Amino acid sequence: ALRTMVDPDTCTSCELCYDRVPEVYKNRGDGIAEVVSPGPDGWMMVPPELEQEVKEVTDECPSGSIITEEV
Ligand code: SF4
């Protein structure tokens, strides 16, 4: 399965991730991206139909702020 998070420390608020994949990411309020549904650790499990989309924005994020991994 796939899980993803956003590092707010490095996000440049380019709006790419939560414009492309609103199912996974959202504008936290001030332009910084955040997963729509994080756990205590901050990770969000990605629905299988959204895996390829999540992997794409992970590579496309200009600031390397999106962290994604297989679990
Ligand atoms: S794509 Fe990266 S830099 Fe752009 S809003 Fe999302 S996390 Fe921030």
CSV table of N, CA and C and ligand atoms in Angstrom, one decimal:
chain,number,residue,atom,x,y,z
A,1,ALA,N,0.8,-1.2,0.0
A,1,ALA,CA,0.0,0.0,0.0
A,1,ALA,C,0.9,1.3,0.0
A,2,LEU,N,0.3,2.4,-0.3
A,2,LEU,CA,1.0,3.7,-0.4
A,2,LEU,C,0.5,4.7,0.6
A,3,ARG,N,1.5,5.4,1.2
A,3,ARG,CA,1.2,6.5,2.1
A,3,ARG,C,2.0,7.7,1.7
A,4,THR,N,1.5,8.9,2.1
A,4,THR,CA,2.2,10.1,1.7
A,4,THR,C,2.0,11.2,2.8
A,5,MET,N,3.0,12.1,2.8
A,5,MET,CA,2.9,13.3,3.7
A,5,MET,C,3.5,14.5,3.0
A,6,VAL,N,3.3,15.7,3.6
A,6,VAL,CA,3.9,16.9,3.1
A,6,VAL,C,4.8,17.5,4.2
A,7,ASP,N,6.0,17.9,3.8
A,7,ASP,CA,6.9,18.6,4.8
A,7,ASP,C,6.6,20.1,4.7
A,8,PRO,N,5.9,20.6,5.7
A,8,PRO,CA,5.6,22.1,5.6
A,8,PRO,C,6.8,23.0,5.6
A,9,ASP,N,7.9,22.5,6.1
A,9,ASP,CA,9.1,23.3,6.3
A,9,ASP,C,9.7,23.7,5.0
A,10,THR,N,9.4,22.9,3.9
A,10,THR,CA,10.0,23.1,2.6
A,10,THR,C,9.0,23.5,1.5
A,11,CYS,N,7.7,23.3,1.8
A,11,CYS,CA,6.7,23.7,0.8
A,11,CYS,C,6.8,25.1,0.4
A,12,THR,N,6.7,25.4,-0.9
A,12,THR,CA,6.8,26.7,-1.5
A,12,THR,C,5.4,27.2,-1.9
A,13,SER,N,4.4,26.5,-1.6
A,13,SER,CA,3.0,26.9,-1.8
A,13,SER,C,2.7,27.1,-3.3
A,14,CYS,N,3.2,26.2,-4.2
A,14,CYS,CA,3.1,26.3,-5.6
A,14,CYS,C,1.7,25.8,-6.1
A,15,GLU,N,0.9,25.2,-5.1
A,15,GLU,CA,-0.5,24.8,-5.3
A,15,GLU,C,-0.7,23.6,-6.3
A,16,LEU,N,0.4,23.0,-6.7
A,16,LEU,CA,0.4,21.9,-7.6
A,16,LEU,C,-0.4,20.7,-7.1
A,17,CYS,N,0.1,20.2,-5.9
A,17,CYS,CA,-0.4,18.9,-5.4
A,17,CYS,C,-1.9,19.0,-5.0
A,18,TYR,N,-2.4,20.0,-4.4
A,18,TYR,CA,-3.8,20.0,-4.0
A,18,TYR,C,-4.7,20.6,-5.1
A,19,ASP,N,-4.1,21.0,-6.2
A,19,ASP,CA,-4.9,21.4,-7.3
A,19,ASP,C,-5.1,20.1,-8.2
A,20,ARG,N,-4.1,19.3,-8.3
A,20,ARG,CA,-4.1,18.1,-9.1
A,20,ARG,C,-4.8,17.0,-8.4
A,21,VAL,N,-4.4,16.7,-7.1
A,21,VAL,CA,-5.0,15.6,-6.4
A,21,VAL,C,-5.7,16.1,-5.1
A,22,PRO,N,-6.8,16.8,-5.3
A,22,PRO,CA,-7.6,17.3,-4.1
A,22,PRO,C,-8.1,16.1,-3.2
A,23,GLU,N,-8.1,14.9,-3.7
A,23,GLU,CA,-8.4,13.7,-3.0
A,23,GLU,C,-7.4,13.5,-1.9
A,24,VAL,N,-6.2,13.9,-2.1
A,24,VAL,CA,-5.1,13.6,-1.1
A,24,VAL,C,-4.6,14.8,-0.4
A,25,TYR,N,-4.4,15.9,-1.1
A,25,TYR,CA,-3.8,17.1,-0.6
A,25,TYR,C,-4.8,18.3,-0.6
A,26,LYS,N,-4.5,19.2,0.3
A,26,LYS,CA,-5.3,20.4,0.4
A,26,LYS,C,-4.5,21.6,0.9
A,27,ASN,N,-4.9,22.8,0.5
A,27,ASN,CA,-4.3,24.1,1.0
A,27,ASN,C,-4.7,24.1,2.5
A,28,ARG,N,-3.6,24.1,3.4
A,28,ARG,CA,-3.9,24.1,4.8
A,28,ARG,C,-4.5,25.4,5.3
A,29,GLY,N,-4.4,26.4,4.5
A,29,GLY,CA,-5.0,27.7,4.8
A,29,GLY,C,-4.2,28.9,4.4
A,30,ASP,N,-2.9,28.8,4.4
A,30,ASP,CA,-2.0,29.9,4.1
A,30,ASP,C,-1.2,29.6,2.8
A,31,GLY,N,-1.6,28.6,2.0
A,31,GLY,CA,-0.9,28.3,0.8
A,31,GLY,C,0.0,27.0,0.9
A,32,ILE,N,0.4,26.7,2.1
A,32,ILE,CA,1.1,25.5,2.4
A,32,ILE,C,0.2,24.2,2.2
A,33,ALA,N,0.8,23.2,1.6
A,33,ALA,CA,0.0,22.0,1.3
A,33,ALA,C,0.0,21.1,2.5
A,34,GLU,N,-1.0,20.2,2.7
A,34,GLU,CA,-1.1,19.3,3.7
A,34,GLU,C,-2.0,18.1,3.3
A,35,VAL,N,-1.7,16.9,3.7
A,35,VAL,CA,-2.6,15.8,3.4
A,35,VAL,C,-3.9,16.0,4.0
A,36,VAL,N,-5.0,15.6,3.3
A,36,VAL,CA,-6.4,15.9,3.8
A,36,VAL,C,-6.7,15.1,5.1
A,37,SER,N,-6.0,14.0,5.3
A,37,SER,CA,-6.4,13.1,6.4
A,37,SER,C,-5.1,12.4,6.9
A,38,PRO,N,-4.4,13.1,7.8
A,38,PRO,CA,-3.2,12.5,8.4
A,38,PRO,C,-3.4,11.7,9.7
A,39,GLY,N,-2.5,10.8,10.0
A,39,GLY,CA,-2.5,10.1,11.3
A,39,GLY,C,-1.7,10.9,12.3
A,40,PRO,N,-1.5,10.4,13.5
A,40,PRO,CA,-0.7,11.1,14.5
A,40,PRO,C,0.7,11.4,14.0
A,41,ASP,N,1.2,10.4,13.2
A,41,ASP,CA,2.5,10.5,12.6
A,41,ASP,C,2.5,11.6,11.4
A,42,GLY,N,1.3,11.8,10.9
A,42,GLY,CA,1.1,12.8,9.8
A,42,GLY,C,1.0,12.2,8.5
A,43,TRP,N,1.2,10.9,8.4
A,43,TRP,CA,1.0,10.2,7.1
A,43,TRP,C,-0.4,10.0,6.7
A,44,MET,N,-0.7,10.0,5.4
A,44,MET,CA,-2.0,9.6,4.9
A,44,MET,C,-1.9,8.4,4.0
A,45,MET,N,-2.7,7.4,4.2
A,45,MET,CA,-2.8,6.3,3.4
A,45,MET,C,-3.5,6.7,2.1
A,46,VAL,N,-3.0,6.3,0.9
A,46,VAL,CA,-3.5,6.6,-0.4
A,46,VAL,C,-4.4,5.5,-0.9
A,47,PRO,N,-5.6,5.9,-1.4
A,47,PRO,CA,-6.5,4.9,-2.0
A,47,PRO,C,-5.8,4.4,-3.3
A,48,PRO,N,-6.0,3.1,-3.6
A,48,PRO,CA,-5.2,2.4,-4.7
A,48,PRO,C,-5.4,3.1,-6.0
A,49,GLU,N,-6.6,3.7,-6.2
A,49,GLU,CA,-6.9,4.3,-7.5
A,49,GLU,C,-6.1,5.7,-7.7
A,50,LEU,N,-5.6,6.2,-6.6
A,50,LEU,CA,-4.9,7.4,-6.5
A,50,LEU,C,-3.4,7.3,-6.4
A,51,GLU,N,-2.9,6.1,-6.5
A,51,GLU,CA,-1.5,5.8,-6.3
A,51,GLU,C,-0.6,6.5,-7.3
A,52,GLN,N,-1.0,6.2,-8.6
A,52,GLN,CA,-0.2,6.8,-9.7
A,52,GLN,C,-0.2,8.3,-9.7
A,53,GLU,N,-1.3,8.9,-9.4
A,53,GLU,CA,-1.5,10.3,-9.3
A,53,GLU,C,-0.6,10.9,-8.2
A,54,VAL,N,-0.6,10.2,-7.1
A,54,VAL,CA,0.2,10.6,-5.9
A,54,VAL,C,1.7,10.5,-6.2
A,55,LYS,N,2.1,9.4,-6.9
A,55,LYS,CA,3.5,9.2,-7.3
A,55,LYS,C,4.0,10.3,-8.2
A,56,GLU,N,3.1,10.7,-9.1
A,56,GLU,CA,3.4,11.7,-10.1
A,56,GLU,C,3.7,13.1,-9.5
A,57,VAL,N,2.8,13.5,-8.6
A,57,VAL,CA,3.0,14.8,-7.9
A,57,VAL,C,4.2,14.8,-7.0
A,58,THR,N,4.5,13.6,-6.5
A,58,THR,CA,5.7,13.5,-5.6
A,58,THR,C,6.9,13.8,-6.4
A,59,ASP,N,7.0,13.3,-7.7
A,59,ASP,CA,8.1,13.6,-8.5
A,59,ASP,C,8.0,15.1,-9.1
A,60,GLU,N,6.8,15.6,-9.2
A,60,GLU,CA,6.6,16.9,-9.8
A,60,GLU,C,6.8,18.1,-8.8
A,61,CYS,N,6.6,17.8,-7.5
A,61,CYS,CA,6.7,18.8,-6.5
A,61,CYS,C,8.1,19.5,-6.6
A,62,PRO,N,8.1,20.8,-6.8
A,62,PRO,CA,9.4,21.5,-7.1
A,62,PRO,C,10.3,21.6,-5.9
A,63,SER,N,9.8,21.4,-4.7
A,63,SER,CA,10.6,21.6,-3.5
A,63,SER,C,10.9,20.3,-2.7
A,64,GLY,N,10.5,19.2,-3.3
A,64,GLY,CA,10.7,17.9,-2.7
A,64,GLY,C,10.1,17.7,-1.4
A,65,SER,N,9.0,18.5,-1.2
A,65,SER,CA,8.3,18.5,0.1
A,65,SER,C,7.4,17.3,0.3
A,66,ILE,N,7.0,16.7,-0.8
A,66,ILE,CA,6.1,15.5,-0.7
A,66,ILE,C,6.9,14.2,-0.5
A,67,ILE,N,6.6,13.5,0.6
A,67,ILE,CA,7.3,12.3,0.9
A,67,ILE,C,6.3,11.1,0.7
A,68,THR,N,6.6,10.2,-0.1
A,68,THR,CA,5.7,9.0,-0.4
A,68,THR,C,6.5,7.7,-0.3
A,69,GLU,N,5.8,6.7,0.2
A,69,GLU,CA,6.5,5.4,0.3
A,69,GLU,C,5.5,4.2,0.3
A,70,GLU,N,6.0,3.1,-0.1
A,70,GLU,CA,5.3,1.8,-0.1
A,70,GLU,C,5.3,1.2,1.3
A,71,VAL,N,4.2,0.8,1.9
A,71,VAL,CA,4.1,0.2,3.2
A,71,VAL,C,3.3,-1.1,3.0
B,1,SF4,S1,3.6,20.5,-4.9
B,1,SF4,FE1,5.2,20.6,-3.3
B,1,SF4,S2,5.7,22.8,-3.2
B,1,SF4,FE2,3.8,22.7,-4.4
B,1,SF4,S3,2.2,23.0,-2.8
B,1,SF4,FE3,2.4,20.8,-3.0
B,1,SF4,S4,4.0,20.3,-1.4
B,1,SF4,FE4,4.1,22.6,-1.7
